[PDB]
Amino acid sequence: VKRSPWQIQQAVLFALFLRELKTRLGGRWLGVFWVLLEPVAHIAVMTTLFSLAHRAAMPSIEYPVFLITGLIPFFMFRGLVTRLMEAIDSNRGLFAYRQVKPIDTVIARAMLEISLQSIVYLIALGTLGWLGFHFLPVRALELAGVSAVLIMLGASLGLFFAVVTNEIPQARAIVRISLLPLYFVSGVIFPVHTIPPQYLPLLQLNPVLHLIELSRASFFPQYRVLQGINLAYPAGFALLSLFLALMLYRLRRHQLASV
Amino acid sequence: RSPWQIQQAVLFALFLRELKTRLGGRWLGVFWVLLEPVAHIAVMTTLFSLAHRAAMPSIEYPVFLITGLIPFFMFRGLVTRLMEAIDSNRGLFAYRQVKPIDTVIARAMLEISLQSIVYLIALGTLGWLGFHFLPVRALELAGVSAVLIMLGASLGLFFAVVTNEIPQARAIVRISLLPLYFVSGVIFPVHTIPPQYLPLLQLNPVLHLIELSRASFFPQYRVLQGINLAYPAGFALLSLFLALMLYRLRRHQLA
Amino acid sequence: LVSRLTAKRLQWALVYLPMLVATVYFLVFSADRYVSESVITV
Amino acid sequence: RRWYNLATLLVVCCLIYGVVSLVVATIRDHQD
Amino acid sequence: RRWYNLATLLVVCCLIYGVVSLVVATIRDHQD
Amino acid sequence: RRWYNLATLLVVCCLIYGVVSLVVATIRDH
Amino acid sequence: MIELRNLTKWYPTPHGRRYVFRNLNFRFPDDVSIGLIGRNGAGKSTLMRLLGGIEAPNEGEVVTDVSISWPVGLSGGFQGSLTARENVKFVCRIYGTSHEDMLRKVRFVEEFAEIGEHFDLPMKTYSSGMRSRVAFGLSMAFDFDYYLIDQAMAVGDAQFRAKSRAVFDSRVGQANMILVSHNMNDIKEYCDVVVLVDQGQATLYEDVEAGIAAYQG
Amino acid sequence: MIELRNLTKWYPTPHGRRYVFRNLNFRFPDDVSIGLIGRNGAGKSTLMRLLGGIEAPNEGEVVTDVSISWPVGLSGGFQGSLTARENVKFVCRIYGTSHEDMLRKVRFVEEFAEIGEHFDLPMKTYSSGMRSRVAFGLSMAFDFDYYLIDQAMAVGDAQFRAKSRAVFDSRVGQANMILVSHNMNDIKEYCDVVVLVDQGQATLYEDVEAGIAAYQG
Ligand SMILES: Nc1ncnc2c1ncn2[C@@H]1O[C@H](COP(=O)(O)OP(=O)(O)OP(=O)(O)O)[C@@H](O)[C@H]1O
Ligand SMILES: Nc1ncnc2c1ncn2[C@@H]1O[C@H](COP(=O)(O)OP(=O)(O)OP(=O)(O)O)[C@@H](O)[C@H]1O
Ligand SMILES: [Mg+2]
Ligand SMILES: [Mg+2]
């Protein structure tokens, strides 16, 4: 009858999900294999050039498992930022039906990609288990909580960038490349225990480093954690970012539908 | 009129159009590009100054960084700006005299002029501070810079032509410019790289060109084994020939 | 349901009640713990 | 540490309430 | 090095003249 | 160093005023 | 029943704000088909966007106790790199429709447009007037009460005009039309009243000829 | 004079290459204004693209010895985020005009297109009518002999149509007119013969009414 706004929102989200599903992993499913073999392509060269270095840095942790426990969460974060940014400008012409609000595009993109990344995480864990490596986390609940905090932080940052940069098309690249240094300062590639102490405080300003360390601490036993690394700082960072991004979308809600 | 005059007029008009968008409405871009290299150099003075002095004490970071930054910045600007062409002038391909090659050519002239001005200003302000700034072998430096210019323009044209069908593959190319800045030896001397890692890096012609430019600039700057000009020159020539021939192939698809 | 959470219910269930119960526990119930510190090495 | 904990909790509660209110306002606006 | 310095000055002068000619053309076209 | 602390206090006050103005504009436009 | 209550719409120009529409208290007529005549630089397209709920008025409200179709327009409104088929599925999925009537709507849209294999090709391959047939078919597939037409049928053959007239006659007695175009015989044959916008003010003529003559001079 | 030489045009599609033109030989009559009409999705825009030098035929050629204007239409030919004034300036600089002649052409375009402050704004924030006015003025500001109007006059007021008719009558002695349109009164009032394209072939009707009747039915 009246089609209460929750029903309209869920229908729009489902339609947008189906629409961008074709555009995300190729029109002929040629991209799903690419995202399947991308993590193994990363870890192959990573272990190839760092196996002995990681063995000397810390024993009792296999390098493939250490790399897997930090890659896929970072893939989630990076892809969340990128797709959340591009969602608003991807469907400019679709803002012509009184129901496709700009927030729905980014929500559908996030809801598609978190599912895809959970799927590839499950496949990676199964593959690691099939090779005799350690794959079952010791404390899965805390790992899930840290992963959820990281996911919502990434979604918040993506929404903020989408609502801000939309008026500046060349700004996207400025934050499209900035993810690459984060791939080398978050401790995903190499353990942070070997970093010089004097660079430790400034490096601790990154919440992604804290989240990666906390997620790794809930995956392996006896995994030590750097002093000053906590969850309260990333939690506050992410919550404040989400509040600010929601407010900024509220202010410039009508500007984003200019088409 | 003669075709050369038509091409010259089209290139001049495209340069005039591109200057306003590249610089800005109030020309605020000059406040950025001039500040472009400095923001990179200063942080490296707080990172590996003592490490560089331990590595090589003959030369200094404020000059060693400049001798390899602005040439790399100019190569990267050539590649990026030439890759983003054609599309940014797609609506202008409606007058039968504006061809897709003219856009990349005009962007090449604009980037070359801007980066040459930046180089001159940087050398002037380096000599103002008392640092060594006059090149030792200017002609060899000019030749190596010209080889780098040709290689960069060739790569930009090739990527602009080949990305027409697949726009997304363009973006990762920009991402691919980031690791080169870390592996071309611009930030740090490459003499500290372990010996088993250098032969893989020798396949990068930008590293050879940067090393040769630094050798031609500084007095008594050593060159590692396997570093030559013949390999980058052949790479640039082959890439330019292939890019031009591929543009000849898809001459009408872009338009 | 979804179209029933007025501003009164949202404020009371997310700001007022948790603050009231926490401040009651902190001011009235919580017992204070003194800390003694030492610094050594072998 | 009573008062600092109370202040931090107050800020967190205010932020959570604001986020929830903004989310429900975003949801509500979808009309025909 | 007489001829070497002369060639260097030739290259520098040509580059400077080209850049200043471009700047002068832009100024003359903009100034109407 | 009173004159050094003055600039820091000015920066803090300006940031607080900006945040308060943004949030009050958000409330007003609601 | 459609009414306007103190609309004001402007845009963020570099030189201040260009107020396209100042305070408007216009009340539209009822049970008639309206022709928005206007002129170049007026607010006809903005009015049709506001009436369709596309963008909210800057300082006003558009009360409408009736269902109004989206503005068909002449540019945009369709998704890139997609065929018309998947565009129709997207549009009917927005409205929450069952699969059987969804396929029926897709069939109706396909049979309205005299398009061959191009119907399963992206919209870029379409001609400038084929997308108008696709848009008109999609708009007329759904049930509304006030179809907003914005110069869409200006790029169609005589067969397209005949088809549009026939389908609208098939929909006579249950729906209305708000048509904006600069082709005056179209307004003469399609509209019963005239609304002329001028300096941001809308004036109603109950006769086509009076408003059309004001338009000419 | 413009003659075709067995030219074939096709586009890359997954299902193959659809032939818009297949071995076409045609000779446009001289000293007359040609009405190029046809059903939707049948030439008339690829044809005008080839006439204006937009693209080249894959196997064939177009032979002329007469200057041809660029194909002004409903879209293209202008750069967004660029002021219409500097777009006209770029177009004038392309043809290598002197500074005084460039200023004269800019002034003529500005006075023809009755637009106020919006003339000094980016072309993206333009309505269809004012963009059409700017395009028509730019096309008429150059000394050509044949003008390629790709139904760009369908979104113009009575003022724009009257001004276009007057400015074409000002130089009707030497210049000519190749116009594609789906409206019929303008074609009758401008063109002297008719060229009808149906599938891949063009046919000449020396009588306007005969070609109009053939295209309509
Ligand atoms: N996106 C925009 N941003 C800013 N100003 C705009 C924008 N779109 C239009 N305008 C301005 O508002 C005016 C409204 O014109 P609109 O697009 O509604 O066309 P119109 O004059 O009603 O009809 P026609 O298609 O016959 O020109 C434009 O002339 C322009 O000055
Ligand atoms: N870029 C393209 N890619 C593929 N097919 C195209 C492309 N451009 C045009 N076509 C096709 O070429 C044929 C010729 O149509 P064209 O684009 O010339 O329009 P038209 O006949 O002038 O349109 P209308 O009369 O409706 O305005 C059509 O079938 C069209 O779909
Ligand atoms: Mg309009
Ligand atoms: Mg056409």
Q: Is the dihedral of CA D3, D9, D14, D15 positive or negative?
A: positive
Chain D environment of A236 (Cβ under 8 Å): 12
Helix (H) or strand (E) holding H195: strand H193-197
Task: Name the token pair of A150.
Answer: 């990281």
Q: Do B113 and E22 touch (CB under 8 A)?
A: yes
d(CA A259, CA H125): 11
Of G129, G159, G182, the CB nearest to H157: G182
Are D28 and C22 a contacting pair, CB within 8 Å?
no
Cβ of residue G118 lying under 6 Å from some atom of ligand 2: yes
Task: Name the token pair of G158.
Answer: 């005589």
**3-class DSSP assignment, residue H147:** strand
Are H152 and H140 a contacting pair, CB within 8 Å?
no
* Ligand 2 atom closest to H151 (CA): 27
Q: Which of G199, G208, G178, G169 is nearest to G32 (CA)?
A: G178
Q: Who's near G47: CB < 8 A, 6+ residues apart? A: G21, G36, G180, G197, G202
Please identify which residue in the block is written with the tokens 């030749």.
B143
Looking at residue C30, the DSSP 8-state letter turns out to be P
DSSP B27-42: -TTHHHHTHHHHHHHH
Are B210 and B186 a contacting pair, CB within 8 Å?
yes
* Ligand 1 atom closest to H156 (CA): 26
Cα-trace Rg, chain C: 20
**3-class DSSP assignment, residue B172:** helix
Q: Do B17 and H80 touch (CB under 8 A)?
A: no
Q: Do chains C and D touch (3 or more CB pairs under 8 A)?
A: yes
Please identify which residue in the block is written with the tokens 């082709």.
G183
Angle in degrees, CA H168, H169, H175, rounded to 5 = 60
Query: In angstroms, what separates the C-alpha of H24 from chain E's closest C-alpha?
Result: 46
Q: Tell me, what amino acid is at G89?
A: K
Chain B environment of E8 (Cβ under 8 Å): 138-139, 142
Distances (CA, A) of A73 to A39, B150, B184, B188: 11, 41, 30, 31
d(CA B227, CA A194): 33
* Ligand 1 atom closest to G38 (CA): 22
- Upper half-sphere CA count for residue B41 (Cβ side, 13 Å): 19
Q: Do B94 and H79 touch (CB under 8 A)?
A: no
Rounded to 10 degrees, what is the CA torsion of A146, A147, A151, A152? -30
d(CA B109, CA B177): 21
Cβ of residue H45 lying under 6 Å from some atom of ligand 2: yes
**3-class DSSP assignment, residue H146:** strand
| G44 appears as a binding residue in the annotation | yes
Task: Name the token pair of B208.
Answer: 């050879």
DSSP B177-242: HHHHHHHSSSSS-GGGS-TTTHHHHTT-HHHHHHHHHHHHHSTT----TT--SHHHHHHHHHHHHH
Q: Tell me, what amino acid is at B183?
A: V
Q: Does B171 touch chain A (CB under 8 A)?
A: yes
DSSP chain G: --EEESEEEEEE-SSSEEEEEEEE--B--SSS-EEE---TTSSHHHHHHHHTTSS--SS-EEE-SS-BPPP--SS--S-TT-BHHHHHHHHHHHTT--HHHHHHHHHHHHHHS---GGGGSBGGGS-TTHHHHHHHHHHHHS--SEEEEESGGGG--HHHHHHHHHHHHHTTTT-EEEEE-S-HHHHHHH-SEEEEEETTEEEEESSHHHHHHHHH-
Are A162 and A108 a contacting pair, CB within 8 Å?
no
**3-class DSSP assignment, residue A173:** helix
Task: Name the token pair of H73.
Answer: 């239409």
Ligand 1, atom 17, lies closest to the CA of H127
* Ligand 1 atom closest to G47 (CA): 18
Of H127, H159, H216, the CB nearest to G45: H127
Q: Do E4 and B139 touch (CB under 8 A)?
A: yes
d(CA G22, CA G6): 8
Please identify which residue in the block is written with the tokens 């890139």.
G80
Cβ of residue H43 lying under 6 Å from some atom of ligand 2: yes
Angle in degrees, CA H143, H145, H147, rounded to 5 = 95
Ligand 1, atom 25, lies closest to the CA of H128
Ligand 3: centre distance to CA G133 (Å) = 18
Query: In angstroms, what separates the C-alpha of A94 from chain C's closest C-alpha?
Result: 27
Find, in chain E, the residue whose alpha carbon is nearest to that of B142.
E11
Q: Who's near A165: CB < 8 A, 6+ residues apart? A: A85, A171, A172, A175
Q: Describe chain A by its helix, strand, coil percentages, rounded to 5.
A: 70, 0, 30
Task: Name the token pair of A47.
Answer: 């272990």
Resolution limit in angstroms?
A: 3.1
Helix (H) or strand (E) holding H197: strand H193-197
**3-class DSSP assignment, residue A7:** helix
Query: In angstroms, what separates the C-alpha of G90 from chain H's closest C-alpha?
Result: 23
Ligand 3: centre distance to CA H129 (Å) = 8
- Upper half-sphere CA count for residue G140 (Cβ side, 13 Å): 28
d(CA G5, CA G21): 12
**3-class DSSP assignment, residue A231:** coil
Cβ of residue H74 lying under 6 Å from some atom of ligand 2: no
| G118 appears as a binding residue in the annotation | yes
Phi, psi of H196 (to 5 degrees): -110, 125
Phi, psi of A131 (to 5 degrees): -95, 10
